[PDB]
RNA sequence: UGACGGAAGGGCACACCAGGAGUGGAGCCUGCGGCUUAAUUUGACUCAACACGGGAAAACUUACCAAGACCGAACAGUAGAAGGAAUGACAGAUUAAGAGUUCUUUCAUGAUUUAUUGGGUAGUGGUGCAUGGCCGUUCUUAGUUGGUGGAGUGAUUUGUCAGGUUAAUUCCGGUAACGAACGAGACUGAAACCUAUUAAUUAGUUUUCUGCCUAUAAGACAGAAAACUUCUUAAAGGGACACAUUUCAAAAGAAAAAGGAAGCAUUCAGCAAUAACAGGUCUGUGAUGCCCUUAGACAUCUUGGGCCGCACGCGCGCUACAAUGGAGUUACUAGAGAGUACCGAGAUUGAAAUAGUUAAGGAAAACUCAAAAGAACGUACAUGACAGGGAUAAAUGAUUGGAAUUAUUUGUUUUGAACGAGGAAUUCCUUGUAAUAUCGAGUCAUUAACUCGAGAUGAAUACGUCCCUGCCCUU
C-alpha cells in the first residue's frame, strides 16, 4: 500500500491498531489504514503474529530481525 | 310469604363448572331437612329464603 | 362512650327485617363496623368470607367505582355518597342508612338460574348483586343527563327501598325471578 | 333573575354576515364565525368592554358595530400581531383580516398558487393524499 | 406443609444419637441442633428443629418405628 | 386546638383571597399591557378567567416565598403548571410562564416584600411585617365563624 | 424537664415521625394544625384516635408530627397511627402499664391498624405486562 | 481532619477494611469514628436474552452493587494512617481525603 | 495523504483521574474482560487459566495464573502499555503455577481442543481427561461435545462422571466452565467442560448434616 | 408586498428577512461551499449566454433572487428533472421540484 | 487523489459512528455506565464484569 | 333537542316562584326538570329565592346544590 | 392470679414487701401490672434483685446482661463481654456472676465491667452462690439428666424447672407458660 | 416401548365458572401482507411470526436503487526502474462535486509500486437442511437414570409401586428389590419487623446564641453553633418450625381461631434435570465448513434516493365519545432513576410561548431533579358533536444538525371531521393485584403513543370444577 516513506520508517523504529479505518492513530497520528496494511504485509513474512482481540490488533516482534535489521 | 331455611351441611359442588352448591338445609318452622341447590359461596351456618319448599333438588 | 356516627350526622341504630341477612350485614354488631369514614384499607379481600365484616356503607362505596375512567377514585366516590345520604334523608326523613338496608333487602332477587333449572341465591349473593344492580341504575340513569351522580343514586335507593318498580333495581330483579319462576 | 324582554332577547345575530346563536355567552357566540376561536373571541370582548358572562341575545345593536369593526381592524385596537392568523402576508399587507367567509377563499386560492407551481405540496393536495408527510400505508382509510 | 427427607432424616439421627439433650420446648430445641450438629443455614436448622420436638412429642406416649435410641433400648 | 405563630395557620385560598385585594386596594402593582392578551404558560388553551388573575398570583406567588425560604423563577415555573394533552400522546408535565411569574417577582420587589438573596429570592421584614399582619385577620374571622373539630360535639 | 417520648406510623410508603410531649393540647402537622389538612374529607380519618378514648387524653399532651412520604391519604393513614402510638407509649413511660393496657386494647378492639403498620407494599414489575400480574395480548392468526 | 472512603463490589471486602482500620485506630491513634454506611448503589441492567428476535419476548436482570463506606479521623495528616491500605483485597479502592 | 479527521486513542478508563463510582468498576471490569481474553489468544500454547489484576495504590499488578511455563514477561507487558496507554512505571507482570492442574477447566478444555485437533478419536481423548480431572480432587465433571464427529449430519455427545448439582445458587459458588472451540477440516466441534468443585473454596452446600458422633 | 424588480435589485441580506424562519435560519448559518460553488456557477452560465441547463444534486438550495432567470435540473433519485425557476418558487426549498417517486397506479 | 475523498464523511453524532468494544456491531448498543458493550456481547461478558443474574 | 329555555320570560318566573320553594328537595337539576329552564338560570334563582327567605340551604357546595322548603 | 405477660414467665423475685419484678419469654420485666421495663431483644433466663430492694438484674438470650434501678425503672447498665446465650446470674452486691451457651463463667462487677473468665465441657445452667456453685448440662456441679437449679431432666418423675402448666420459675408466686403466674 | 382415542379412574393451570378491564367498531402512532416503484433491502407466519431482530432509518447505520469513482490486489519470480517504478496537483474544459475521474500545459515527491503470472484476501453474499455459541419451545409440571440383584430366548420389565398425603416419585406405608445421582426441596436477591448492638455525613432531631415577625403564651423564619440516633442509611445478629391449642384424617398431614411485623412453601422473582425440534440467529462476533463474486467487484468510498412509497386486509397500542366531565385559578403529596474533558444544569435576565445572552455547584445521601391523578376555590359551563374530540389543512416563531423538501421536534392564531360506548369473535387478570393517571431509564446530534422499571389513588368477584382448552399420572 502506498505509504509516505518519511513515515514509513517510523513503524519500523510490539506495536498495536485499532480495525477501524475510518479514523487516524493515536501514536503516529497516520491513518489506521496505513497501519494495517504495513504490518499485515508484514506478517506473511512471519516476521510477526497477527493476534486479534476486541477489534485491536497486537504484533509481536520475531525471523523479524532479520528483516528488519536489513531494512 | 317466603320461608327461611337453614343450612345444616353441603353436599358437594356439582353443574358442570362448578356454580351450584348442594347443601340439605332445614326449615325452622317445620324442623324437616330439605336438600337444595344454592349458587353462589355458602356456609355452613347460613340461613337460606325459600319461596317453594316441595322441590327436592336431586340432580337425578 | 364512643358512639361513631357515619358523617357525624347518621347513626347505626337501625334493624334488618330479613333475618336471612342479619349476619352478614356489618352495621352494629361490633365497634370496628361503625365508623366516621367509608374508607378503611382493610385486607377484606384475602380470606372466604371475609367481606361480611366490610361496613356495608362501605361496600356501597367501592361499587360505585366502575367503568375503566372512574378506577380508583374512592374519594370521588366518598362524596357523591355522603351528598346522596342526605338527599335520601330528606325524600323519606328516616335515617340513610335505615333507607339503604331496607333497599338491599328488597332489590335482591331470591331466585335465579343456571345451565336451565331454577336455583336459589345464597345470602352473600343477594347483597353483593343488591349494590350491584342499584350500582347499574344508577350510573346508567346518570350517564348523558343532566343531573347529578349523588341525586340520581339518592332517588334509586328511595324507589328500591319499599316497593316501587320504577327502580332499576327492582325492574331487573323481578325479571330475574320470572326468568327462574317458570325454570323449575 | 329577572323578566328579559321579548325585544331584547334575539334569538340569532347578524354579524360579518354570518349566524350567531343568541343563547351561548358572548365569547363562545363570536367563535361561530369562521375567523374567530376562543383565544381571539376572549381576546375582542375584553377590548371592546362588553361583559363576558353576559347572553350574546342580550347585545344591544350598539356593541355589535363596536366588535364587527375591533374583528375587521384589528391592528389599531392594541390586538399583538402574533395573536393574528395571517401574517407576514403575501400580496401586500401583514394582518390576518380574516374574519370573515374568506377563511375559505385564502384557504383555495393557496393550492392555486401552490398547484399552479407545480409544487411537491401542492401536488398532494391535488391528488388528495396526506400533505404534511404521514404514513399512507395504514391510516386515511376513507373509503374509495 | 410436608417436610422432605433431608430434614426428617436429620430429624431421626439427631434423635437417636442425642436424645437425652432434647426436650419437648423448641427454643432450647434450636439451640441443641446448632450445638449438637452443623447446619449452615440458619431456615433449615428450625425445620429439622421444628421436626424434633413433634417427634418427642410422639416419642412420650409410645415408641415410634424408625426411632431406635439407646434409653429405648436398655429398657427393651 | 389552634394559635397563631405564623401564616401556616390560615388556609392559603383564604388567606392568597384575603392578600388578593389588599395589594388591589394600595394600588402599587401596575398592570402590563399584555394583563389580558396571554395565558398563563403554554399547556392552557384560554387566558385566565378572573379579570384581576394578577393579585391572585401575586399573593400566591408571594407566599411561596414565606414557607420557602431561596426560591427561583423556575421553581415557580413548574409549580404553576398543568398538563400538556393537547394531542393523541400521553399528557406530560410543563412549566409555567417565565414572564408572567418573574413580571410579578420583579413587582414585588418594588414593594419591598421581596429581596435578593445571592441564590434566589427571599421576604424583607416590612414585608414579612405586613404578611402577617393580615394572616392575624384572617385568622380571628376563622375561628369565630367555623369551630374547631377538637371542641367538636362528641356525636 | 418536659417528659416526651418518640413514635412513628407507617402505610404504603408515608413515615409519621412524633414527638409526644407534656403541653397544651396542641398538634401540628409538617407546622400546619390538624384541622387544616389538604384532604379535608380525611380530617375526620385523622382525628378519629382522639375520640376513641376521649379528647382529654391528649390534653396534657403537645404534638409535633412530620410526615415525608407516600401520597396524600397514606400520609392521612400514618397520622393516624402516630398520634395512637403516641398516646400508647407516652401512657407507659410516664404512667402505669394497666392504663396503657387498658387503652391499647380499645384501640386494637376498634381497629387492630391504628397501632401496627399495614404489611402490604407495591409489587415489582415483570416483563411481558403492563403490571406486576397483567400480560400484553397474544394475537393468535 | 481527615476522610476515608472505601468502596467496593462485595460487602465482606468493605466491611474487612473499616473493622481492621478502626482495630489499626486503637494503636497510634486517638479515636475511630464508625464506618459511616452510605446508601448503596444498585447498577441495573436489564438486556434481551435472545441473540435475534424469534422466541417469546423474555429479558434477563443484571444488577452490580456498590458499597461505600466513610471513615473520618483527626490524626496527624502527615502521619494518618501511613499506608492506609494495608494489602486491600482486589476490587477494593480506598481514599483520603484533606 | 487522506482527509480523515478522528483520533481513536488507545486509552484505558481505569487511569481516568476524575470517575464516577458507577462508572469505575463497571469499567474495571470491561479492562478485566478484555486483558483476561486478549492473553487468552497469546498463551493459548501455555494455556494461562486465569487473570488477576490486583494494585498497590498507584501500579496496577498483572498476574498470570498459567499452568505449565523473563522475555514473554518482558514482551507481554510492552503489549500491555501499547493497547492501553499505561504509563511505564506503575505496570508489572508475574507468573504463577498452579498445582490443581485437573481443577482448572480452561486448562483442561484446552488438552481435549489439542487431542481432538491432533487427531485422536473423541471417546479417547476426552475419557484419558476425565480420569486426571476427577482424581485430583473435583467432585464431578460434565465435558459436553457437539459438532460434526462422526459424519456430515451434526451430533452431540455428553460424558458425565461424578456427582454435579444443576440447579440452585449453589452452582455459583462451585461451578468451574470454560468453552472452547477447535476447527478441523470439516466444521468447528464445540468443547464444554464444567468442574464441581469441592469444599477448598469453604461453604457446604444446601442439604448437608453431617452430625458428629458422641 | 414589492416589486419584482425590487426584489431583484436589493441586497439579499435584506430579501432573507422577509423570509420564513426555516429559510432565514438556512442563510443565517454558514453559507456552504457546496451551494456557493453552485451559485458562483449559476451566474457563469447567464455570462456566456433559455439558459444552459446546469444538472445539480443540491437540492436543498433555498432559492432566492439571483437564480431566477437560470434553468437547472435536480436529482430525483435517477434522473435531473428539469425545472425553470420562476419569481413565484422563491424561498421555497429548490428540491420540492423533483419529485423521487411514481405516485401510484 | 485516488485516496482524498474516502471517507470524507464526517461521522461525530453516531448510529453508525459508534461501535461495539469486541463485536464491531452498530446494533444494540449499550452505552449506559459507559460499557459501550453491544447486546449479545454485555450478556457473554456479564460474569466476568460483575453484573450477576440477580433480580 | 331539550330546548330548555336560556332566560327568563314572565310566565316561566311566576310558575318558577310559586312551586319551587314547595318541592322537598331542591337541586338545580331537578328544578330544570319540571320549571324546564337552563339550570345555568337554576342557580340564578335559587340565589334569589334563598336572598328572600324561602329555601334554606342544607349542602350549598363547589360540588352540588341542594336546598328545601323553608 | 397476675396478669400482663406475653409468654413463659421464666424468673421471679421478689427483692420489698409488694414489688415484684418477673421477667418471660417476650422480652420484658413486669414490676407487679405498675411498670414494664424494656430493653432486652430475646427472652429472660433468669432474674437476680440486689439486697437493696431497689436495684435489679436480669440475664437474656441476646448474649448481655442488663442492670435496672426500681427507682427510677431504666436499664442504668449493660453487661457485654459474653458469646452464648446467658442462662443465670447470681449476686455476691459487689461481684456479679454469670454463665450460660458460652460454657464459661464471668465474674462481672457492679459497675459493668468483668475481671475472669473461667473457660463445664457444656453449657452452663445455672450459676449461685451460698463460694458460687456452678450447674451445667454435663451432669456436674464443679466450680443422670442435666442440672438446673441447684440451691434436671432426670425428674429426681418429670423435669425439675426451678396440676398446674409447666411453672418456669418459683420464689410461692410460681410463673408458668401460659402466661398465668 | 412411545404416540393416539368423540375409553375409564384420580389430580392441575385465569382453562373455564362469578366477575372487572377490555380489544374488535372512530381518528391517529407503529409492524406484517398486498399494489406501485429504480429500489420500495431483509429474516420471522398458530401458540413457539406481525411496538419482534433491543429495528424510535434525513446523511453513516444500510444489506436496495441511479450515477461516479477505488484496491482494503498480501508474498514470490519477470519486465520496467533513482539517467525516474510511479504518486500528488493550480487554473480552463468534462463532472452533482473544492474526486487531477479525464483532456492541452507543466510543477512538486521519490522505490512507498505500476504491468504481469502463481496466489491469497475481502464480503450485512448463499447455505441455521453442513456447524459452534446463545435463545425459544415440548414444560411450570414433576419427571429422568445406572451399580448389583429377580423375571423374559428378546426388545424390555422391577427399583420408579396397593392405599393415604403434599404445591412436588414431597412424604407415612406395602414391597424382588437394595443402595444411590439429578430434577422438587434445600439455595440466592427484594418486601414484611427490631425504641436491643454497632454506627453519624453528604440523614434527621434537639439545644444554645444573634437578628427579625406575629401572637398571648406559643412559637415561626434566617444565620452560626455544639451533643443525640426514634425516623434515615446499612452491617452483624435476632425472628416461625405450622410450634402450639381445637377438630378431622397408630402415620404423613389438613381446616378455623389466638398470638404475631410476617401463618397459601408468607409473597414476588433468580437458578432450574434426561431426551428432543432437522424451531430462530452464518445480518452480533477476526467463531466458522462448503459454494458464489473477487478490478468493468456483490469489498470499500462519495453524492442523491429508498427502507416513510397507497386501491385494500390483519396485529400490538395512544386519544376519545363527557357532568364519576371539560375549561380558569389556589394549595399539595412519592419512589426509583441519571450526570463532566465536555454531561446533568441551579440563580439572574430579554418574552406571549418553545427559546436566546450570561452563568454557581456537582464525578454526586453533598448540586442538579422537579408529580399528577386526586382535593379546593366561583350565583362560570347545562346537556346542546356544546367549551366533549383534536384529525385535517393555512399563515407565520424557533430549536438540533454539514443538510429539515416527503412537514425531525416544537410555539401563536385560525381551520372543528369521524367518533352517541362499538356485530361476529377474542385477550389479560385472584390483592396494594386489575384498572386509572403520571415519573425515571434504554434508544437519545434531534425524535415516544415503544419497552424496561418506579411510585400514587385501591374495585368487583369463587376459595371452586374438568365443561371448554390443554397438561401430569394409572390397567
Redesign the pocket.
Known sequence: ?????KD?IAIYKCIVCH?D??CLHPVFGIPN?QV??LM??????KCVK????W?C?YWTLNEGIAYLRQK | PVIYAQVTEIL???G????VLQVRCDIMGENRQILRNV?????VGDILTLLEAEREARRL | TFAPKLFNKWSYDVTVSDISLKELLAINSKLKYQVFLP?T?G???????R?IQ?PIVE?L?????????????????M??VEESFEIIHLLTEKNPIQVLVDAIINASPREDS?RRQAVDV?P??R???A??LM?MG??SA?????????E?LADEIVNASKSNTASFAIKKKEDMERVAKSNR | ?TVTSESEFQHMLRVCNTNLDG???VP?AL?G?????????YLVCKRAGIDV?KRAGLMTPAEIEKIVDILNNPLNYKI?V?????????KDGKD?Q?IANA?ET??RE??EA?KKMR???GL??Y?????????????????? | ??????V?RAARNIIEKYYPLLT????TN?RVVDEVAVVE????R??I???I???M??IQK?PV??ISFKLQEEER | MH????I?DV???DF??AYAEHLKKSGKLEIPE?VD??????????????PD?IY??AA??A??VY?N???????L???????????????????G????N??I??QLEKMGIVA?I?????LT??G??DM??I??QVYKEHEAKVTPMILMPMN | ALKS????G??????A?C?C?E??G?IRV??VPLDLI????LRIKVFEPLFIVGKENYAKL?L?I??????????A?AIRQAIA?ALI?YNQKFVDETTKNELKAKF?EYDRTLL?????????????????????????? | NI?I?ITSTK??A??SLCAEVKENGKKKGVQ??????????????????????????????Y?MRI????L?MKTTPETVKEITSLKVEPGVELEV?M | ?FCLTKTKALNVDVL?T??????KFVADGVFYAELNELLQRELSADGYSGVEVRKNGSKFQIIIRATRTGRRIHELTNLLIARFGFPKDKIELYVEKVLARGLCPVSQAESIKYKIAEGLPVRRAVGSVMRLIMDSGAKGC?V?????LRG???Q?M?F?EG??????????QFYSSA?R?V?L????????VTIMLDTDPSGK???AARIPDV | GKSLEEITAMPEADFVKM????A???YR??P???HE??VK?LL?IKKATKPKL???????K?ILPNMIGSVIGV??????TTVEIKPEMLG?????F???????? | ??????????????????T?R?????????????LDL???????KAVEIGFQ??? | ????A?LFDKATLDKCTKEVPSMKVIT??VV?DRMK????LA??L???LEKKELIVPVKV????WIYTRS | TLEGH?GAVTSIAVAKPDVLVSGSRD?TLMVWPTKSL?????FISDLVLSNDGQFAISSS????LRLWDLTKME?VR?F?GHEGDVMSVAFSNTKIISGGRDKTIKLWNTVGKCVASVKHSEWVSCVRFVKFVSAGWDNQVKTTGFINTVAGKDGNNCQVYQKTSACMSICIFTGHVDKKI
Open positions: 500500500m502506498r505509504i509516505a516513506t514509513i480495525k479505518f475510518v489504514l494495517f496494511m499485515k504485509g508484514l506478517a506473511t513474512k497477527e493476534t486479534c482481540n477489534r490488533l | 358437594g359442588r356439582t358442570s363448572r362448578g356454580g349458587k353462589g359461596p355458602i356456609r | 374508607h384499607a385486607r377484606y379481600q384475602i380470606k372466604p368470607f367481606k366490610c361496600r362505596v367501592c361499587c360505585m367505582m366502575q367503568h375503566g375512567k372512574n378506577s380508583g377514585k374512592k374519594l370521588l366516590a362524596r357523591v343456571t345464597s352473600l349473593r347483597i353483593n348483586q349494590l350491584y350500582t344508577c350510573r346518570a350517564f348523558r343527563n343532566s343531573k347529578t351522580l349523588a340520581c | 333573575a343563547r351561548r355567552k363562545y367563535t364565525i369562521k375567523g374567530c376561536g376562543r383565544r381571539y373571541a358572562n399583538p402574533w395573536f393574528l392568523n395571517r401574517q407576514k402576508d403575501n390576518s380574516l377563511v385564502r384557504l393557496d393550492i401552490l409544487a411537491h405540496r398532494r393536495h391528488w388528495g393524499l396526506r400533505v404534511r408527510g404521514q404514513h399512507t400505508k395504514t391510516t386515511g382509510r376513507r373509503g374509495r | 406443609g410436608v417436610r422432605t427427607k433431608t426428617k419437648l420446648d423448641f427454643h434450636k443455614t440458619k431456615r433449615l428450625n425445620k428443629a421444628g421436626f420436638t413433634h417427634l412429642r410422639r409410645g418405628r424408625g | 394559635h397563631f405563630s405564623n401556616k388556609v392559603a385560598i392568597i383571597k399584555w392578551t396571554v395565558k398563563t404558560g403554554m399547556c392552557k388553551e384560554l387566558a385566565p378567567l378572573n388573575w391572585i398570583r400566591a406567588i407566599r411561596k414557607l425560604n431561596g426560591i427561583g423563577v423556575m421553581a415555573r413548574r409549580a404553576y403548571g398543568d398538563q400538556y394533552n393537547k394531542h393523541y400522546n400521553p399528557s406530560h408535565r410543563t412549566l410562564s417565565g414572564k408572567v418573574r413580571y417577582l420583579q435578593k445571592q441564590s434566589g429570592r427571599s421584614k416590612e414579612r411585617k402577617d399582619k394572616a392575624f | 417520648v418518640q413514635v412513628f407507617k402505610k404504603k410508603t408515608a413515615i415521625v414527638l410531649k403541653g397544651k396542641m409538617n407546622g389538604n384532604p379535608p374529607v403537645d409535633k412530620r410526615v415525608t412520604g407516600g401520597g396524600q391519604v397514606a400520609q393513614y402510638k407509649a386494637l401496627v403498620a399495614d404489611p402490604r407494599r407495591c409489587e415489582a414489575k415483570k416483563f411481558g405486562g403492563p403490571g406486576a400480574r397483567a400480560k400484553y395480548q397474544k394475537s393468535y392468526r | 476522610t472512603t460487602v465482606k468493605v466491611e475511630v469514628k464508625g464506618p459511616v454506611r452510605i446508601p448503596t448503589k444498585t447498577l441495573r441492567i436489564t438486556t434481551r436474552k435472545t441473540p435475534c428476535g424469534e422466541g417469546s419476548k423474555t429479558w434477563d436482570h444488577q458499597y461505600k463506606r466513610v473520618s481525603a | 495523504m481516568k476524575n470517575i464516577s463510582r458507577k462508572h460434565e459436553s461435545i457437539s459438532g460434526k456430515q449430519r451434526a452431540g455428553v458425565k456427582y454435579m448439582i444443576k440447579s440452585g445458587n449453589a452452582t455459583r468453552v472451540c476447527l477440516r470439516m466444521g468447528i466441534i464445540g468443547i464444554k452446600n444446601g442439604p | 423570509l420564513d424562519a426555516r432565514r435560519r438556512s448559518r454558514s456552504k461551499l457546496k460553488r453552485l456557477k457563469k446546469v444538472k445539480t444534486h443540491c437540492r436543498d433555498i436529482y430525483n433519485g435517477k434522473s435531473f421555497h426549498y429548490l428540491g420540492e423533483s419529485i423521487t417517486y411514481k405516485p401510484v397506479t | 487523489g485516488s485516496y482524498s475523498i474516502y471517507n470524507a464523511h464526517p461521522r461525530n453524532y453516531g448510529n453508525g459512528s459508534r461495539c469486541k463485536c464491531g456491531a452498530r446494533k444494540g448498543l449499550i452505552r449506559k455506565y459507559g453491544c447486546r449479545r456481547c454485555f450478556r457473554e443474574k440477580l433480580d | 333537542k331539550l330546548n330548555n336560556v338545580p337539576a330544570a329552564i337552563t339550570c345555568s342557580k340564578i335559587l340565589k334569589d357546595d363547589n360540588h352540588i | 406475653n422480652k424494656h430493653g432486652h431483644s430475646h438470650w441476646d448474649h448481655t436499664s449493660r457485654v
